[PDB]
Amino acid sequence: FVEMVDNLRGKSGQGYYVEMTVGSPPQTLNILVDTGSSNFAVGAAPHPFLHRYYQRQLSSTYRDLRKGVYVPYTQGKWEGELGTDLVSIPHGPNVTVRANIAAITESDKFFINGSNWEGILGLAYAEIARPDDSLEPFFDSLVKQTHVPNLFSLQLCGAGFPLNQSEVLASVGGSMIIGGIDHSLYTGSLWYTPIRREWYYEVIIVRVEINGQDLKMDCKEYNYDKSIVDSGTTNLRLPKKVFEAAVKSIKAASSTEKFPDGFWLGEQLVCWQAGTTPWNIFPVISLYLMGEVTNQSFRITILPQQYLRPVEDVATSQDDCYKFAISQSSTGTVMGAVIMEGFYVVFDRARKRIGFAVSACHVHDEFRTAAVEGPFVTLDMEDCGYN
Amino acid sequence: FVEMVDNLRGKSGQGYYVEMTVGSPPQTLNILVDTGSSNFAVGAAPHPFLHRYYQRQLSSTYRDLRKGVYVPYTQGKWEGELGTDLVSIPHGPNVTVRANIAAITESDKFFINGSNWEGILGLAYAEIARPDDSLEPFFDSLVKQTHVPNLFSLQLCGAGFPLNQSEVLASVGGSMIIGGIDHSLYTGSLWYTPIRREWYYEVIIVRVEINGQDLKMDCKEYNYDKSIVDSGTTNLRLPKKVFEAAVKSIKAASSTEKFPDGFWLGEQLVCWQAGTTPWNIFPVISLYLMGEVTNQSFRITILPQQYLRPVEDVATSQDDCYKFAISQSSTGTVMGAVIMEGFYVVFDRARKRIGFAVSACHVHDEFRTAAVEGPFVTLDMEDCGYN
Ligand SMILES: CCCCN(C)C(=O)n1cc(C(=O)N[C@@H](Cc2cc(F)cc(F)c2)[C@H](O)CNCc2cccc(OC)c2)c2cc(C#N)ccc21
Numbered sequence: 001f002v003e004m005v006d007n008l009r010g011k012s013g014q015g016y017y018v019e020m021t022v023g024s025p026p027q028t029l030n031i032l033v034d035t036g037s038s039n040f041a042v043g044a045a046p047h048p049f050l051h052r053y054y055q056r057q058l059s060s061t062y063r064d065l066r067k068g069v070y071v072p073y074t075q076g077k078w079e080g081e082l083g084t085d086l087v088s089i090p091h092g093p094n095v096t097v098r099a100n101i102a103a104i105t106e107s108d109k110f111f112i113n114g115s116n117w118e119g120i121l122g123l124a125y126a127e128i129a130r131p132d133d134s135l136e137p138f139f140d141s142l143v144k145q146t147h148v149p150n151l152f153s154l155q156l157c158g159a160g161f162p163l164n165q166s167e168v169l170a171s172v173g174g175s176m177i178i179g180g181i182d183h184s185l186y187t188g189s190l191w192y193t194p195i196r197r198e199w200y201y202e203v204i205i206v207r208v209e210i211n212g213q214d215l216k217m218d219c220k221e222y223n224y225d226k227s228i229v230d231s232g233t234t235n236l237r238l239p240k241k242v243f244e245a246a247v248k249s250i251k252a253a254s255s256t257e258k259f260p261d262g263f264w265l266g267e268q269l270v271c272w273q274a275g276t277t278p279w280n281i282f283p284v285i286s287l288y289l290m291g292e293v294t295n296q297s298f299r300i301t302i303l304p305q306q307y308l309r310p311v312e313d314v315a316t317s318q319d320d321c322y323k324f325a326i327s328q329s330s331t332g333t334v335m336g337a338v339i340m341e342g343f344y345v346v347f348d349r350a351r352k353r354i355g356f357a358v359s360a361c362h363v364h365d366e367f368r369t370a371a372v373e374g375p376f377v378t379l380d381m382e383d384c385g386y387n
Numbered sequence: 388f389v390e391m392v393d394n395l396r397g398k399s400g401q402g403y404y405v406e407m408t409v410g411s412p413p414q415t416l417n418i419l420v421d422t423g424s425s426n427f428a429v430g431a432a433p434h435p436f437l438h439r440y441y442q443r444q445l446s447s448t449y450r451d452l453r454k455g456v457y458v459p460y461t462q463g464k465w466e467g468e469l470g471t472d473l474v475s476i477p478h479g480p481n482v483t484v485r486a487n488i489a490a491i492t493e494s495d496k497f498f499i500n501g502s503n504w505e506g507i508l509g510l511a512y513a514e515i516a517r518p519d520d521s522l523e524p525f526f527d528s529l530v531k532q533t534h535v536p537n538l539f540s541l542q543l544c545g546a547g548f549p550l551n552q553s554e555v556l557a558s559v560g561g562s563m564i565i566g567g568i569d570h571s572l573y574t575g576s577l578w579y580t581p582i583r584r585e586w587y588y589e590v591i592i593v594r595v596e597i598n599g600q601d602l603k604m605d606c607k608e609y610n611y612d613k614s615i616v617d618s619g620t621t622n623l624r625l626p627k628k629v630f631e632a633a634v635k636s637i638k639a640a641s642s643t644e645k646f647p648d649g650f651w652l653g654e655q656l657v658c659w660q661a662g663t664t665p666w667n668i669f670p671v672i673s674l675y676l677m678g679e680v681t682n683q684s685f686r687i688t689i690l691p692q693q694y695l696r697p698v699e700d701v702a703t704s705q706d707d708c709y710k711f712a713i714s715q716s717s718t719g720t721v722m723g724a725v726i727m728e729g730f731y732v733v734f735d736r737a738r739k740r741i742g743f744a745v746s747a748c749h750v751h752d753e754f755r756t757a758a759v760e761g762p763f764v765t766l767d768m769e770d771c772g773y774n
């Protein structure tokens with residue numbers, strides 16, 4: 001799948017995107033890769049943050065569905081007009097599909113200044129598509145209309161340092177392999193967790209450790225009210241009780257240095273002299289996931305290099321600065337972009353499972369790397385799912 | 388070396404011993420394996436703790452050197468009479484050696500009741516032999532007089548739980564492979580550190596971590612005034628400054644549970660309800676050792692299953708009880724039996740180096756294992772040696 005390697009650009013703070021074309025003749029647009037939703041939508045009218053948009057009147061293959069659509073996400077939202085058009089992915093499979101497209105005409109806190117993307121590719125399942133589940137998501141259309149196998153995999157590559165507008169445009173941000181798995185993108189074994197239900201990419205977390213120390217919560221707390229894999233969100237997002245426990249434990253592990261409350265609240269940066277970030281004082285975080293074999297689990301392990309997101313200094317000094325990329329969630333557990341940066345993630349829709357392997361592009365140091373390890377004989381895993 | 392596999396009995400608290408014979412006809416004696424000294428010495432007169440002893444008058448091959456010897460160890464000591472006699476190792480190489488033997492006639496806090504050993508085999512170099520370096524140590528005699536290669540290796544096997552008197556007598560305590568390496572005794576790769584000077588088996592520690600967190604001391608502190616590998620001592624022993632930092636850090640890492648000071652002083656037991664020992668709250672300890680390649684180091688990682696030593700619960704309960712097997716040292720760093728239990732240790736005298744590999748009999752849990760890992764780029768490491 002060499003043609004699809006390195007087809008992504010962007011970063012965790014603003015999103016990872018793929019180049020797509022819509023319409024006839026092709027209109028090129030940059031599209032956010034979002035495993036956390038199921039609508040394919042593009043800017044279709046001028047916006048202060050868009051440098052280009054979808055022009056339906058210029059596409060001869062545009063079909064009007066005569067229907068409005070409203071999509072509220074947790075914080076941002078948009079409103080649009082539904083239609084269909086021919087769609088291609090220049091650095092994807094050699095195919096053209098007719099897919100539903102929501103032409104965005106109004107939005108609030110959706111588009112991101114300087115992100116270089118003009119649309120969103122919702123890669124999850126029909127159940128969470130708006131207006132309802134009859135609006136067939138793009139990936140479903142792709143599989144139905146082509147011979148592309150029913151799976152995709154994602155390698156999101158964090159740089160480990162801040163990127164300005166110029167750098168981010170010229171830097172490779174990762175890979176989206178549509179229809180397969182590319183072996184150059186990972187090391188070690190792929191470990192698979194079942195997709196609990198095909199709506200979001202929902203998984204079940206059975207155990208959490210901070211530097212090997214068990215948080216020792218009822219596992220239902222880890223999945224309350226769901227746990228999802230979401231490339232459309234920056235942070236590891238954790239339910240209230242889990243967040244508080246995790247933060248207390250991370251603070252205690254790293255207590256040789258003190259940080260303001262605002263840092264732990266995800267709001268303010270901390271800076272260190274160039275090169276002197278004390279990675280070793282911060283713990284690793286292991287999430288144990290339900291295995292495919294009964295009574296088995298595996299674990300994925302992330303470093304502070306994942307959960308501390310590089311940010312530019314307010315000064316823009318030689319210092320190395322970061323934000324705490326773990327937040328309290330109103331929506332259950334979310335494995336956002338900063339988690340996904342540690343791993344090659346395989347969305348095996350065909351076998352209703354998600355694969356994890358250590359990413360060939362994850363940021364680490366000489367002393368520690370991200371890990372995917374198993375098996376473990378685990379307690380009563382099904383019970384960890386919330387109802 | 389199949390004949391020598393499983394030729395050890397014992398445990399960390401009382402010593403690991405090998406069967407030997409001395410004199411003509413052969414007198415069978417159990418002998419403590421001690422890499423921390425250089426005198427071969429045996430009980431030679433009745434003692435409350437000895438069920439048998441060396442009877443020089445009954446040996447036709449006994450030679451009386453007409454000279455006294457006094458050996459003070461840190462806490463224990465003995466005096467005796469020097470001589471030579473023929474020595475063999477029934478479950479060792481098929482050879483007979485004429486070796487120096489100190490016939491112990493008086494002792495204080497040396498013999499251990501119930502240990503089942505009657506003598507000591509000092510396997511270190513002539514430099515620390517008493518009365519002086521002219522008294523050829525046993526291993527030197529063995530190599531000089533036979534075709535046995537100048538190398539031995541040790542696998543000390545801790546049970547991970549208490550053994551009673553009959554249990555320790557009927558259990559395999561490990562292997563002393565004289566003249567070679569047995570591949571069934573380890574997993575992974577052997578990593579070698581240089582022997583700094585041929586007296587004690589002296590090594591250089593270049594970095595110490597507690598759960599990945601750097602103790603952040605000048606590396607000379609870890610080797611002040613020396614660091615040795617010592618099977619004749621139970622604990623990991625650390626110079627005052629290193630000990631204080633380590634205990635602080637281990638208390639910090641295990642802080643969710645509080646223990647009396649006397650536990651941390653290695654004096655008192657801590658007990659938990661049967662099977663409930665909270666291994667996960669205790670940190671791993673990594674000792675980085677100087678590599679053979681310039682600017683290269685490797686690390687050995689021990690678990691709490693190594694540094695918490697199982698001791699019997701003498702009360703009516705079924706508790707699992709332990710002592711803290713890390714002590715403050717007046718004599719530099721000592722890698723005692725509890726450390727060695729984690730690893731297969733190769734005393735490669737011929738190449739002036741010590742090999743470490745994960746032991747096939749180390750105690751662990753399903754979440755963590757002991758490790759031997761490298762390489763790490765490390766600088767100015769000869770600077771870590773004390774002068
Ligand atoms: C890599 C993204 C760049 C940075 N941004 C904008 C973000 O970190 N975030 C993206 C979120 C979000 O809500 N993401 C959308 C996509 C999105 C990306 C973006 F770019 C700007 C947006 F409007 C939205 C996912 O799809 C959510 N999945 C669950 C869900 C929640 C609610 C409705 C859903 O289905 C329609 C799905 C989001 C939510 C919270 C909360 N609470 C905090 C930060 C968030």
Ligand SMILES: CCCCN(C)C(=O)n1cc(C(=O)N[C@@H](Cc2cc(F)cc(F)c2)[C@H](O)CNCc2cccc(OC)c2)c2cc(C#N)ccc21
Pocket residue numbers: 399400401402403419421423424425458459460461462463464496497498499515617618619620621622717724
């Ligand atoms: C196999 C462990 C059984 C339990 N015991 C008795 C011990 O834990 N220990 C053994 C020690 C000790 O001093 N060991 C001797 C051997 C020994 C074993 C035994 F069985 C009873 C003993 F008399 C002695 C080594 O040889 C020391 N190497 C450096 C050195 C220090 C001073 C002089 C030296 O060369 C002569 C060497 C020792 C020292 C301290 C101190 N400080 C604390 C505990 C110690």
